[PDB]
Amino acid sequence: SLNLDSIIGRLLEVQGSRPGKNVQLTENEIRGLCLKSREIFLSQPILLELEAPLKICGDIHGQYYDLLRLFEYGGFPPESNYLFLGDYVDRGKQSLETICLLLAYKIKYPENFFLLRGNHECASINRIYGFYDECKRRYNIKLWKTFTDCFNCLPIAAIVDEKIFCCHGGLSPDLQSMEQIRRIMRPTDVPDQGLLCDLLWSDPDKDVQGWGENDRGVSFTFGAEVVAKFLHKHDLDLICRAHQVVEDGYEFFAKRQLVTLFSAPNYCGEFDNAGAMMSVDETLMCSFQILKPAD
């Protein structure tokens, strides 16, 4: 009983409209988006095994019109396949339009559109950084808890053609076998520590040898050698993650063995950074499409 095409059409119609018009779906349409996408998250693996070609995107943080630009330039679904690395809500002005369009595309193209969990897809975080206030202002508290129950079922990591490992944060000192990821039961909250936490919170640091304490107060940092030994132990070529703003939208680490993606340009009007999107073709040749305001 979900009119998915009508939802998507109303979401896409505000393209090219100055100023930033809202798309106010109905409470029941958003609840349908949450419950139908939730079923698809649980029926698909928590550790997604994907095949090229696809485009991989970093943080959005409710910058909805930047999300529309990513689709305009990368190809609206299903002209292209997509994997998002989390942090869809908070800080931005239009988290609701952002997550609703993403959940809608997830339902419409369930095996060509994929969404991973970021550390902001967590009730104890997005209660504070904006999403809850947006849900309360434009809808009600009950809908926010409906989103939380949906977010608690998002997949955690993806591996593209057995060579590109993808997650929001980074590596974990408690990650020896990929089976440890596949064993995490959903739905679940994000714990304050451990493998699931580290996958959504940790960062690479060029100045640490091995594992170090993260300035965020949560999880750890890892160095260039941790990345090399991880790639060698699991026969991987590249680690693709987000979770950190980078001025050119993408940023390599440890001799192109890890890349950080950030897809929200001019991050909430506080940075003059670009937004990037990594295209990988069927031969796993990876390039970057960069989105930047003209100057």
Partner: peptide
Amino acid sequence: KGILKNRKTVTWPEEGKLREYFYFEL
């Protein structure tokens, strides 16, 4: 036409063709 699974190698193009730019009016 799905891509969800139930020997390739990562490569990068010549440095000239690594980035593709899209500029928009803010």
